[PDB]
Amino acid sequence: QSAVEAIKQKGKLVVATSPDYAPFEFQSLVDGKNQVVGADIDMAQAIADELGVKLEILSMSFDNVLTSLQTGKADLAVAGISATDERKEVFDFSIPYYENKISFLVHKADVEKYKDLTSLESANIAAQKGTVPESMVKEQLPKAQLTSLTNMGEAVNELQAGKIDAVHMDEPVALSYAAKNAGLAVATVSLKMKDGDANAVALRKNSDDLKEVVDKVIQKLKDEGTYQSYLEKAASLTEV
Ligand X SMILES: NC(=[NH2+])NCCC[C@H](N)C(=O)O
Contacting positions for ligand X (CB under 6 A)? 18, 20-21, 24-25, 62, 79-82, 128, 131-133, 152, 170
Report the residue number, 119 or 157, with the smaller CB distance to ligand X.
Answer: 157
- Which option in Cl ion, ligand X, none does residue 186 bind, with CB closer than 5 to 8 A by kind? Cl ion
Query: 72-75: long-range contacts at Cβ-Cβ below 8 A with a sequence spacing of 24 or more?
Result: 72/204, 73/14, 73/16, 74/14, 74/15, 74/16, 75/3, 75/7, 75/13, 75/14, 75/15, 75/203, 75/210
Distance CA 20, CA 142 (A): 26
Query: What are the phi and psi torsion angles at 214 (to 5°)?
Result: -65, -40
Told to check if 186 binds Cl ion by CB under 5 A, we report yes
- Compare residues 119 and 150 and give the one whose CB is closer to ligand X: 150
Choose from Cl ion, ligand X, none: what does 178 bind? Cβ within 5-8 Å by kind: Cl ion
Question: Of 79 and 231, which CB lies nearer to Cl ion in the complex structure?
Answer: 231
Q: Are 69 and 203 in contact (CB under 8 A)?
A: yes
Angle (CA) 130-131-135 rounded to 5° is 100
Instruction: Confirm or reject binding of residue 178 to Cl ion (CB under 5 A).
Output: yes
Three-state DSSP at 120 gives: helix
Query: In the bound complex, what is the minimum distance in angstroms from residue 129's beta carbon to ligand X?
Result: 10
Which one, 186 or 234, has the nearer CB to Cl ion? 186
Q: Which does 93 bind (CB under 5 to 8 A by kind): Cl ion, ligand X, none?
A: none
164 binds, among ligand X, Cl ion, none (CB under 5 to 8 A by kind): none
Pairing of strands 124-128, 166-170: parallel
185 binds, among Cl ion, ligand X, none (CB under 5 to 8 A by kind): Cl ion
Residue 24 vs 177, nearer CB to ligand X: 24
Residue 180: CB minimum distance to Cl ion, A: 11
Using CB under 5 A, which of the segments 17-25, 164-172, 180-188, 231-239 binds Cl ion? 180-188
CB atoms within 10 A of CB 208: 12
| Residue 38, binding choice from ligand X, Cl ion, none, Cβ under 5 to 8 Å by partner class | none
Instruction: Indicate the residue whose CB is closest to Cl ion.
Output: 185
Q: Which among 154, 86, 100 has a CA at the least distance from the CA of 126?
A: 154
Q: In this structure, which amino acid lies at residue 162?
A: G
Say whether the peptide bond before residue 23 is cis (omega within 30 degrees of 0): yes
Q: Which is nearer to ligand X, 75 or 80 (CB)?
A: 80
Nearer to ligand X, 3 or 169 (CB): 169
Rounded Cα–Cα distance for residues 187 and 174 (Å): 9
In the complex, which residues of this chain contact Cl ion (CB under 5 A)? Answer: 178, 185-186
